[PDB]
Amino acid sequence: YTMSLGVENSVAYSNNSIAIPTNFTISVTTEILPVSMTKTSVDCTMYICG
């Protein structure tokens, strides 16, 4: 299929009118970041020559 970009909404704009939030949620959301590779070392001499 041709993929959906999302819900094809349109904002109900006007002059002289505004929308104001009456109620709210706290949200908690994960975010994950890597920080380290596995510290690795090669004895190039033993690796090449056994």
Ligand X SMILES: *[C@@H]1O[C@H](CO)[C@@H](O)[C@H](O)[C@H]1NC(C)=O
Question: In the complex with ligand X, which residue's Cβ is closer, 2 or 23?
Answer: 23
User: In the stretch 17-46, what mask flags binding to ligand X with x, by CB under 6 A?
Assistant: -----xx-----------------------
Encoded tokens for 22: 């009456």
How far does CA 48 lie from the centroid of its chain? 42
Tokens of 47: 């690796």
Three-state SS for 7?
Answer: coil
**Residues engaged in binding other proteins (CB under 8 A):** 41, 43, 46
Applying CB under 6 A, the residues found at the interface with ligand X are: 14-16, 22-23
